[PDB]
RNA sequence: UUGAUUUGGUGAGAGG
DNA sequence: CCCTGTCTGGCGTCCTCTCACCTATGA
DNA sequence: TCATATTATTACGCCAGACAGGG
């Protein structure tokens, strides 16, 4: 559940990234192919997206990484697929 | 009283006004500063744009409300548009610059 | 209006600024049902095309 | 996708490239039918088919063939919307010149054809002819001719003459007009000439000369020739019910254009005679004038039947423009609105919203809920379902609210708190249920209020609805530091009655194992709630590293206290709950749960009072009854007695002893005297009224009093309302403004008669129309703020600095107003503060000054911190994040990015509804004196005293800080020296303001230079004393002949040779002013302290009076330049005063008007910022004179004095950043190495940037001048014309930017608000950061 | 491809 | 020629609800 | 029905800004 997003704002410490950060995860949760690293209350994408803030496993260096994995993944992919 | 979607004007591209008309909530100028004052650029952003005026996404906006993807595509408000004609219709050439 | 009995308290918040917290015993007598009349017209003008 | 907008003047080419067909008929449409017009004013092949993709009149009913035009249609074959964009061209035969152009207050072709206005029109009217290049006749080419002066020409000069007139001749005029020739012209005559007037009509003259020269603007662009329609589509022709059409204003303006223009095509083919095609081509010039802005030429045009029709600038212009009403403010999709009521089970995070409410908001998150789970198929199906309402949809509209926050806002939203996001709970009804905390945030009661919902859409919305805008994110209120979801009414009684004693109860000094069985006693039935009782209680004490340690002890307090002690969290002291809790005390509880145990405690802490307050205040019964209002039994005899007193002072009046006005003064003060006596006795009456023994005789103790307990507990009364209902209510006032001398002796219990009722309601209807119409003057102020702040957002982290304004307490002359805590809190220092001490580093030099910092400034007695402004902050287009300090409503400093310049002017604009519309110094404490500013001398009998006008008296005390402050005028008698303690209450100043001192510094004999009786001075020996004086005279009195005289007294020695100054080798004479009176005579040895002659002598709307910066009537004149003074001619207008510096250059003088009375002598030597006049004293005088931080001390103290009279907290960062924007512009005075003018108004980070790019070669910079602007011409005179023109005037602001050319770089909050995209404040500034990054 | 007119504008009154 | 009355333009609060009323002419 | 084209009331209160007048 959530009442306020305080810790959240602990561990990304603008409360102005905090909104990008998290919507950047839960449009990565809600068209998006991924599934979350937390369980879920059955709480919606942007409960989901600050919750996974809190325990702080999600910032801005975590989903640059993962997409840096995923774009050498599809290259890997490309490569083995074609080649 | 609530509105999701109905009809507007004819003028302009935004929602009717009162009740006996099925109309949307006037979100005035002090409203706009208290978005401003507050980091709401988002949601000011879809407050002026998709739920107002822009006809293109408010079209896109519910196809994409429906499918289940809460993401807007702005564009610009069709009222500005008319701010240009209504400017350009004097002898004042007002443009829009470089990409 | 009506006259009805009246108690000057604070009863669980729910007369907090102005507000004002009425029994069932107002609702079941009908003692406030009002009664509005609207009148509605429908005329079939010749616009165009008959 | 762009940047900048560019605006300039339409060419007749870029007319006609904009066009689609040339709109020929006036004929609107055939009426009968309807079809339009082929081809008139909505045709077909200019524009477009009125029907998507349809020839109108019949081809092509399918989609293949997109385009095609046969002759049997004339018409394109495109889109319903795609004629809202194209527009037509009405090809005016006669030329028309813009009425922006001529009549925009300056001309644009008033000042640039070197044409009076006047003259302009007369020949634009066909009223007065106008020559060009006439050839070699003696005649000029501006000078204009009329019928006699043509006639006789015409005659005289028939062959090479040219005498045109109207827009065609004043066209030519223009179009012939040498841009670059005039620029060296104007250029070489304003280096060639000194006169101030013309100096300053021809900088502005070649300012509009150079600018045209530097766009594409041409000058033959301002008269018309291809005037341009605008979309039918953006003129529609709806029919309203029934069968006529409501035609638009625009439609009548656009039709008698192309009427009159096809009548003046069709004379010009007829060959009519001169007066014929005159009127004609007048009367189309006043059709074009009148369609482009109507009514700015002689009285406007109606159709309907007297009110003017609307025309394109009053499109633009206006409130209901475009810009106020559609642009800036929008109507909204998915929005609601209905009456608000309680619900007082929420939790403060959420909101109750009806059902029907909920599922009109939510159907397009219903249909996409139920088109996924398979229930249904097509879209329709889903709108059929919800149509009907099934028993399905109400688990689908559960599970899509769930975790979806709404935006609740009260209709009047002054600041930020007014707009705040929810969770909604479903409510079976029909009323916003609003939790009460959140109520005093939005101003909101329940006596019929009404309050709108909107849904953020997207992803991003919400999660800044839930992350920044939630209700429990905003706990203090963004203004000051304090908290806004204080316990309001009910809740602060419920404590108030909880958290009290009395001297015996059920359970009286029993002892209780904890505070869980005091509950148990009080619901049990054994003890009461108040009854004083030694309990256990383990408070937990953080005094550790963030661990809490744990003491438990016995606390002699009242089962009430721990009951409450159950619900205060864990870190909290128990001496928090120990007290009585009226609201000041519950407020510092939230505030110091807020500043220990941060947020998610004070959220849940903050419910848990509010639950236990409304639970324990139902269970107190506390009614108000007739007996709770006790009447005084003493205040009979006060009425009598003050009777008595009047009898008394009417038989004086009788016997004429004493006068009018002392009398009507002898009445308000005994009836003050009784009216204060009468509100003693009722409020001891009421405050100890109960009276209960406890095992013996008799204790007294406070009352449980009803009335009493709302007025203690601070719940809703005071003590001026309470005394009102049980003592007198005072003395009411007439509309005149004096008081009226007989009162109301009857309170609200007794009765009112008639009389007594009529002057109450004289008094409360000045109340009520004083609000209904101060708030318009509250609201146009937040907006001027708003939009004069408009562009300041957090940029930088650190601008690297040293300079910042000294803060100190305010000190009026009173006790210590403002402490240093209150002014330094939170606000980041600028050099280290040295601790009072000697040389210590006590704190660093770039710390925030939070709670702990302001503590251990408090114990070290620190005297003034020198803290970092927004005034002094480097940054160039922002406030770096050091420069503003603490973010307030968050505990940091503030973020890279927040703007504080909308949440700066909405927190001094906010509280402008409670503000109103319409001998010697006595010391108080007991400390050391000091004294600043102080040139003294001491007399023969030892009291020491001054020899300057401007003397500060300080009260130090033992510590070190200062505790008091006055002014002390040119020669007064103190009682006391320099450095000196003294006792509390002792007076230390004298000195008479009726008869200005010309005490000496020396000894000697008198003589009377230039002082001669019968010119100079006059003989009036005095009537009931004797000892006469001979009466200096003015030289407005005397005679011409003697008038040149100057009468003065100079001191010599026993000899005769003159006494020097000490320190000089001049002699001390003073030169008497006029209206003096000679006190010491001849021969007479003077000495120090003695005179030489006698000489006899707010609340809105000075804040707006303070932002705006007028001028006052009769302002504090002062001297631009230090050094030795004298005076002038005599009285030409006005008396002069000549400024002749010591090193400096002499040739600075001023006229003063001689009404004022002076402060200056003739031997007195000035310094720039010292006074010469007194009064009061605008801010640009501050601003060239003293410098930047002193007009900013100047505003924040006079603007915070408005502010404290009525008592409101605001920080003063909002007034030092509206400062900031007051004074951001500033004029030239060497032009240096740069591009710039010599008197060119440049704004300051343009010039700074400018000479910082070019200090850092070799170049030496440029040396500026700041200037203040007022908020409404700072915020018009702004280098974006957008900004500019939302706000007030368009039509000047739009000509101005069209004929420079301007364009606008959008970079600000309401450019982007205007052009639909993200504000570059808040979540969008990393948006431009990167936008701004890729270039 | 399955449907339609107030906004426009004035005046008066009301709510917070 | 620098003060100066005098005249002309340009502001004047947001949100909402109910009702009625709408150019003359004319062979 | 289908082109023809504009006249006999006053009663705000500052507050800047530009303009002819005169010592
Ligand atoms: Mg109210
Ligand atoms: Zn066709
Ligand atoms: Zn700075």
């Known amino acids: 559940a959530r009442v306020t997003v305080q810790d959240a704002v602990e561990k990304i410490g603008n409360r102005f990234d905090l909104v990008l950060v998290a919507a950047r995860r839960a449009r990565q949760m809600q068209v998006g192919g991924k599934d979350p690293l937390v369980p879920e209350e059955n709480d919606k994408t942007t409960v989901i997206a600050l919750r996974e803030i809190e325990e702080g496993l999600i910032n801005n260096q975590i989903l640059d990484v993962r997409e840096r994995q995923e774009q050498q993944e599809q290259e890997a992919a490309e490569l083995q697929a074609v080649t | 009283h609530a509105r999701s979607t109905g009809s507007y004007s004819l003028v302009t591209q935004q929602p009717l006004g009162g009740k006996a008309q099925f109309g949307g909530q006037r979100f005035g100028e002090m409203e706009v500063w208290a978005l401003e004052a507050y980091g709401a650029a988002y949601t000011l952003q879809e407050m002026l744009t998709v739920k107002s005026d822009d006809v293109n996404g408010r079209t896109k906006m519910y196809k994409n409300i429906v499918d289940g993807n809460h993401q807007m595509e702005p564009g610009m408000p069709e009222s500005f548009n008319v701010l240009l004609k209504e400017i350009r219709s004097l002898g004042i050439n007002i443009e829009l610059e470089d990409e | 209006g009506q006259n009805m009995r009246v108690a000057f308290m604070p009863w669980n918040g729910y007369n907090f600024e102005d507000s004002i917290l009425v029994s069932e015993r107002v609702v079941q007598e009908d003692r406030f049902t009002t009664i509005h009349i609207q009148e509605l017209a429908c005329v079939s003008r010749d616009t165009k095309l008959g | 996708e762009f940047d900048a907008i560019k605006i300039a003047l339409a060419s007749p080419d870029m007319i006609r490239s904009w066009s689609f067909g040339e709109v020929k008929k006036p004929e609107t449409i055939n009426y009968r039918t309807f079809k339009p017009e082929r081809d008139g004013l909505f045709c077909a092949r200019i524009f477009g088919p009125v029907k998507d993709y349809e020839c109108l009149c019949g081809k092509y009913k399918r989609l293949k063939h997109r385009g095609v035009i046969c002759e049997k249609c004339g018409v394109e074959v495109t889109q319903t919307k795609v004629r809202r964009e194209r527009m037509g061209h009405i090809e005016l035969a006669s030329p028309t010149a813009h009425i922006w152009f001529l009549k925009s207050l300056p001309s644009r072709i008033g000042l640039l054809l070197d044409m009076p206005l006047r003259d302009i029109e007369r020949v634009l009217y066909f009223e007065s002819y106008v020559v060009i290049e006439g050839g070699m006749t003696n005649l000029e080419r501006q000078q204009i001719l009329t019928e006699e002066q043509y006639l006789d020409a015409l005659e005289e000069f028939g062959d090479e003459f040219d005498a045109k007139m109207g827009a065609e001749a004043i066209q030519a005029l223009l179009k012939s007009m040498d841009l670059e020739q005039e620029c060296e012209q104007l250029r070489e005559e304003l280096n060639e000439t000194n006169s101030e007037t013309k100096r300053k009509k021809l900088t502005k003259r070649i300012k509009l000369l150079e600018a045209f020269v530097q766009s594409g603007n041409k000058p033959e662009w301002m008269i018309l020739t291809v005037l341009p329609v605008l979309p039918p589509d953006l003129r529609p022709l709806v029919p309203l019910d029934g069968g006529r059409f409501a035609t638009s204003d625009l439609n009548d303006l656009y039709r008698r254009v192309i009427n009159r223009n096809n009548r003046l095509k069709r004379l010009l083919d007829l060959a009519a005679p001169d007066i014929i095609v005159r009127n004609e081509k007048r009367m189309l010039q006043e059709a074009v004038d009148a369609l482009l802005d109507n009514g700015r030429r002689g009285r406007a045009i109606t159709g309907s039947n007297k009110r003017p029709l609307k025309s394109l600038a009053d499109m633009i212009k206006g409130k209901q423009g475009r810009f106020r009403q559609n642009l800036l403010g929008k109507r909204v999709d998915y929005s609601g609105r209905s009456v608000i009521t309680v619900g007082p089970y929420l939790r403060l995070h959420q909101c109750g919203l009806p059902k029907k409410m909920a599922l009109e908001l939510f159907k397009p998150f219903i249909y996409g809920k139920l088109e996924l789970r398979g229930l249904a198929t097509t879209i329709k199906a889903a709108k059929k379902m919800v149509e009907r309402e099934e028993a399905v949809v109400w688990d689908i509209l559960d599970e899509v609210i769930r975790e979806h926050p709404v935006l609740l806002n009260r209709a009047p939203t002054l600041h930020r708190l007014g707009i705040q996001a929810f969770e909604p709970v479903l409510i079976e009804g029909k009323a916003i249920q609003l939790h009460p905390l959140v109520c005093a945030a939005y101003n909101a009661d329940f006596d019929g209020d009404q309050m709108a919902v909107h849904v953020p859409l997207t992803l991003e919305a919400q999660l800044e609805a839930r992350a ?540 009377f230079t230039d002082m001669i009786d019968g010119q100079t001075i006059t003989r009036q020996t005095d009537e009931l004393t004797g000892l006469s004086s001979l009466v200096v005279l003015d030289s407005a009195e005397r005679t011409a002949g003697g008038k040149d005289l100057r009468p003065a007294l100079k001191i010599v020695d026993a000899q005769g040779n003159d006494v020097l100054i000490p320190g000089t080798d001049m002699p001390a004479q003073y030169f008497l002013p006029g209206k003096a009176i000679v006190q010491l005579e001849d021969g007479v040895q003077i000495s120090s302290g003695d005179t030489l002659a006698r000489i006899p002598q707010g609340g809105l709307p000075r804040v707006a009076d303070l932002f705006e910066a007028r001028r006052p009537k009769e302002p504090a004149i002062l001297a631009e330049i230090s050094g030795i003074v004298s005076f002038g001619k005599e009285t030409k207008g006005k008396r002069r005063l000549v400024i002749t510096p010591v090193d400096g250059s002499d040739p600075y003088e001023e006229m003063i008007p001689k009404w004022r009375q002076l402060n200056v002598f003739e031997g007195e030597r000035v310094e720039r910022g010292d006074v010469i006049s007194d009064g009061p004293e605008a801010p640009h005088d501050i601003l060239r004179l003293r410098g930047v931080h002193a007009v900013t001390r100047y505003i924040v103290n006079e603007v915070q004095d408005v502010y404290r009279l009525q008592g409101v907290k605001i920080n003063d960062k909002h007034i030092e950043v509206i400062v900031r924007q007051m004074l951001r512009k500033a004029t030239i005075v060497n032009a240096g190495s740069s591009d710039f003018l010599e008197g060119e108004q440049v704004e300051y980070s343009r010039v700074k940037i400018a000479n910082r790019e070019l200090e850092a070669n070799g170049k030496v910079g440029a040396t500026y001048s700041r200037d203040l602007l007022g908020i409404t011409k700072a915020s018009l005179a702004t280098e974006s014309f957008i900004s500019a023109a939302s706000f007030q005037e368009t039509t000047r602001v739009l000509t101005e930017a069209a004929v420079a050319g301007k364009r606008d770089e959008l970079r600000g909050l309401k450019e982007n608000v205007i052009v639909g995209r993200l504000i570059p404040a808040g979540t969008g500034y990393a948006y431009h950061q990167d936008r701004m990054r890729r270039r």
């Open chain 4, 468 to 1007: 920044l805008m939630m209700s429990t994110n905003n706990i203090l209120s963004p203004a000051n530091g304090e908290p806004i979801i204080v316990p309001s009414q009910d809740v602060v009684l419920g404590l108030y009655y909880m958290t009290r004693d009395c001297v015996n109860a059920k359970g009286e000094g029993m002892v209780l194992t904890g505070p869980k069985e005091a509950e148990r006693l009080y619901r049990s039935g054994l003890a009461s709630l108040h009854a004083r009782v030694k309990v256990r209680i383990t408070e937990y004490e953080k005094d550790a590293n963030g661990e809490l340690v744990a003491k438990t002890s016995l606390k002699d307090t009242t089962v009430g206290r721990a009951i409450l002690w159950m619900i205060v969290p864990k870190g909290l002291p128990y001496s928090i709950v120990n007290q009585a809790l009226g609201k000041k005390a519950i407020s510092k509880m939230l505030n110091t749960c807020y500043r220990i145990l941060g947020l998610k405690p004070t959220v849940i802490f903050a419910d848990q009072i509010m639950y236990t307050g409304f639970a324990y205040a139902a269970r107190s019964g506390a009614s108000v009854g007739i007996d709770d209002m006790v009447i005084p039994e003493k205040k009979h005899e006060i009425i009598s007695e003050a009777e008595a007193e009047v009898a008394e002072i009417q038989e004086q009046f009788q016997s004429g002893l004493v006068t009018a006005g002392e009398r009507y003064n002898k009445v308000i003060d005994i009836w003050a005297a009784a009216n204060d006596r009468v509100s003693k006795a009722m409020m001891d009456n009421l405050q100890t009224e109960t009276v209960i023994n406890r095992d013996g005789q008799e204790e007294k103790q406070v009352s449980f009093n009803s009335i009493y307990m709302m007025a203690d507990s601070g719940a809703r009364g005071s003590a001026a309302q309470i005394r009102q209902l049980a003592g007198m209510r005072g003395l009411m006032a007439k509309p005149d403004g004096s008081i009226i001398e007989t009162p109301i002796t009857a309170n609200f219990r007794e009765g009112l008669n008639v009389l007594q009722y009529f002057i109450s309601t004289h008094g409360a209807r000045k109340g009520l129309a004083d609000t209904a119409l101060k708030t318009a003057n509250s609201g146009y102020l937040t907006r001027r703020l708003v939009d004069v702040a408009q562009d300041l957002v957090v940029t930088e982290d650190d601008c690297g600095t040293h300079e910042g304004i000294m803060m100190t307490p305010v000190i009026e002359g009173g006790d210590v107003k403002e402490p240093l805590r209150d002014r330094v809190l939170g606000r980041v220092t600028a050099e280290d503060v040295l601790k009072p001490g000697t040389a210590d580093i006590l704190v660093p030099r770039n710390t925030l000054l939070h709670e702990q910092w302001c503590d251990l400034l408090e114990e070290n007695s620190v005297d003034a911190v020198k803290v970092r402004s927004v005034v002094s902050c480097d940054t160039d287009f922002g406030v770096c994040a050091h420069c503003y300090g603490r973010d307030l409503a968050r505990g940091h400093i503030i973020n890279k990015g927040e703007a504080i310049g909308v949440i700066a002017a909405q927190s001094i604009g906010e509280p402008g509804t409670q503000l109103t519309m319409r001998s010697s110094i006595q010391v108080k404490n007991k400390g050391s004196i000091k004294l600043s500013n102080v040139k003294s001398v001491v007399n023969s009998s030892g009291k020491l005293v001054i020899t300057s006008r401007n003397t500060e008296l300080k009260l130090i005390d033992e510590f070190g800080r200062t505790k008091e402050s006055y002014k002390v005028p040119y020669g007064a008698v103190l009682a006391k020296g320099d450095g000196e303690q003294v006792a509390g209450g002792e007076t230390v100043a004298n000195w008479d303001p009726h008869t200005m001192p010309v005490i000496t510094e020396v000894s000697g004999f008198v003589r």
